[PDB]
Amino acid sequence: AGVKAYELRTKSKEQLASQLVDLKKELAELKVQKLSRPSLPKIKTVRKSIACVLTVINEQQREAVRQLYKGKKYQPKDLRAKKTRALRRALTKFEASQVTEKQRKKQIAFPQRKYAIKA
Amino acid sequence: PEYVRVQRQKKILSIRLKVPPTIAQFQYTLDRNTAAETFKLFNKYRPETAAEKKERLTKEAAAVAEGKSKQDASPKPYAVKYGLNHVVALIENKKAKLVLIANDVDPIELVVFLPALCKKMGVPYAIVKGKARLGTLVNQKTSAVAALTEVRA
Amino acid sequence: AISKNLPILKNHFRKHWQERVKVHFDQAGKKVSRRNARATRAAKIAPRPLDLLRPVVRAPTVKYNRKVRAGRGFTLAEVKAAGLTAAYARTIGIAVDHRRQNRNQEIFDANVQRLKEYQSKIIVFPRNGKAPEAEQVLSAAATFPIAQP
Amino acid sequence: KALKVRTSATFRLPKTLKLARAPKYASKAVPHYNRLDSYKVIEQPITSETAMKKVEDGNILVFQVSMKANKYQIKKAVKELYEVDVLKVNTLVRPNGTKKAYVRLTADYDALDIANRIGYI
Amino acid sequence: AAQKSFRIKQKMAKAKKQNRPLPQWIRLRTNNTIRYNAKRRNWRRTKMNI
Amino acid sequence: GAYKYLEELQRKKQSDVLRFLQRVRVWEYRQKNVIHRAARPTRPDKARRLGYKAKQGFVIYRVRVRRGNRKRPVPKGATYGKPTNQGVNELKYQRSLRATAEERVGRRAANLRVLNSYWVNQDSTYKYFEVILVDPQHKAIRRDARYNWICDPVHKHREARGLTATGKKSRGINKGHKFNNTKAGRRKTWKRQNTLSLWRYRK
RNA sequence: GAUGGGGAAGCUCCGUUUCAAAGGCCUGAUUUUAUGCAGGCCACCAUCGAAAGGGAAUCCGGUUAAGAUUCCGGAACCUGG
RNA sequence: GUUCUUUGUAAAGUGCCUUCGAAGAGUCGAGUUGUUUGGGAAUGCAGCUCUAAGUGGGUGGUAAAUUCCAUCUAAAGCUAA
RNA sequence: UUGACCUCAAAUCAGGUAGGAGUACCCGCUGAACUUAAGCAUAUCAAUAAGCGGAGGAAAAGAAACCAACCGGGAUUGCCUUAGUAACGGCGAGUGAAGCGGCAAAAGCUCAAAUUUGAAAUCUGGUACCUUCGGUGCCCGAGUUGUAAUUUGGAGAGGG
């Protein structure tokens, strides 16, 4: 069972923090019962629910920071794209498509014509 | 420190050695009274700054909008010429009327040929103190040369 | 070592020659990929004939000067006599060689005539509009064969 | 002009105004939560017979503790989780790699009363 | 030694936890080929070399 | 144009003006570090002929290297082989002093790219070079399509792979019958003419 | 055994205070106040290297299946504030 | 293919006459030494020494002097298959 | 006294970048000996193995200071051939390319050296806004010891 992320996403951060601390209290109360009982499979659901609550809290905070840094250069490095080191160091499309004005004049004057050959 | 020691011992060595006359053709610079009055003359002919250039272009654009003069609403400029290749071409074309050469160009081989070229082409030259003075004349930091080529009446 | 009446052999196999052995197992697959590359290039340049027009030109040495063959590109003098600039010829599909010269009037006249027939045979499309599609052929060399005089 | 008097033959590097960092962007942009909080420093009690002899005789609770926790963190978290004032903490590292903490409570509280409140006896 | 370092004690703790026989329910799984702990180590027979 | 005056004056190296100027500058360059940053090119005409432009992102370093042969680094001169390989003293390095100078400059500034180098001075002990370097992260070189080819990752350490002017000179890359051993790469040609080619239908 | 430097095609080598612009210390002054500006003092010049060298300070009694100068009871001492 | 912006009093090409036509230096080259090459009075590379010219310079597989001829344009740079 | 310039520094200054791995193939440096010569020293193995530096999906080379000597060809690369040839070699053992010809693929180019001189026309950065692989305005700065436009020898420039 456990908690559901889509219904966790509608709450505020204080309710999420309180739900997290009651989940941790429940996990401690199950861990003190695990030593007396032979098996206790209910611990795994509480563990995964704690993971779900932490994931929702982190994604809410990260989205708030993204909207704070929206529409400006120099956003933080973990928020900007990852792809690879070489693709990050590669030239952008604008810089790669930069051409001299002399070559631009030559390309406008003499572009590669489309032609066919029968008649 | 070593930079202080190098910059002192370098000018020590440059007079310990017997310099060949193309150097120490310099270091007889202009005297301070005539230098002051020639910079007072040159200060009247100063190149235009960026802001007055910008309003000059707005006036030119408005004038070609209203009357369509061929960029000839503004009068003929009278400014000091600067820049090394520019003034060498002016001296070779015999257009320069008076050429000032800074005495402290730090490759001296940029300007050692300039007095001989001025003497051959008949242009009067003066070795003057201060590439910084020439730069603040032409609204730069350093100018290393200056030239009056055409003066008002 | 040396033995019965046999010719003296010179087999250069005293290095580690088994480290450099190239067996062309990929002849058939390389041919198939080569035809695939030709077809995708033709589809990419879908009206144009996949190769430039080459001049007729006389082969260099005394062993081969009896024959005539294809060159790299036309002379600037040849394209000026044909009546079009070198940049325009390069855009409409004529190979131009800036570094060969004309010393032979027969070769010059043959190349000028060859350019005249090419300009008569091609269709040049307008740069903007209708593009009147025209069912490409794939070999300007096959449509303009090199003929021995 | 006159030069500056120097009473020492040594030349030292002059003192320069050193500014503080004013970054254009944050370093990690989400500050991490508490790495080692009260629920992580106290894993579970040890309920072997040797440990259970201590809880009425010595008035000492025995807990299993994360290996990153020290005595200040153990004491603060026992005070926060069980609302009990503690006398002292003695820790060891067990031969299985875990950490064990003997927490001796003050005389006002009874560890036997607290252990079955927690849920083990 | 009695005065040991924490790295040595950590490796000793890991080897002590590894020192156990096979769990007996492993043999009941389908397509099980594991018969016994082949990586078992005893202090009399082979040394850790740490 | 002053630059052709600077060139044709620079060819008169044993004229008294140039040997005085050389004599002062070689002392000034011994007094500095082995590798140090030059503020401006000493020969701006030579720099801009090799490709320098006076804009942001063009860097000049000055460098001196030790002259002479390369002593074979063997303990006490023992080579342990046939007498044709017993030479220690008169052996020569196959690359140039200009090449090892710009390679040390590139190791000093690995974030830059080596463009060219030129001789400035020498004495009995050292040879002095000035190295032109371009910053491939500066936006004035990311833009300006005449120079953004240096930002392509195939040009990392051209001076280490021998792709500069003196590198190609030392590798022997030139057209002609005098360069049959070294024309497309010496080891490439050696592999090409030491390969044994076998076809499916054996010729 | 780094650094400053100097060799070496280079992996790296030399050197350890050297052809270096090599730093921090207390009083405070100010009480938009933060810690700059008032000051003044000092020139070693990284760091690693001993469970037998140097070194702040704990003893007795009892207690466990297995721990103790470490736990319990009593009685002390040192360091920092 | 369909649509919006008119780029642009801008840019490019082509014919004839006239005056010109800037073209890379401790480099080219030479001696010597070592290595390398099929390269042979010396194929390339590198060290040291000497060190250019501008109807010039390089090459034209036997060294040198003299007279020609032919063919390119170094000592700066990019580029798919 | 004050304000510049040049040169050299310092900052946990604003923003970036390098190192290491992999390494079949690629670009260089450095560099053997076993072996063969029926011994062995030049030679050979081999301009190889080992060692070191540096890249990419390919790399390198590449638009002639070329090949030729002909009725001349025309960037580079690769295949077939030239050819086990010309040549080198205790002329011994052994080594050993290149031009032409056919084919695969084909593609060309740009800086420096020129006075814009009737107007540094050029560019990084910061800030504000926006449609954000960037654009516009403003402000410092870089830059005349030369950043833009114009030309690259096949040409081309200035006038008419």
Ligand SMILES: [Mg+2]
């Ligand atoms: Mg040496």
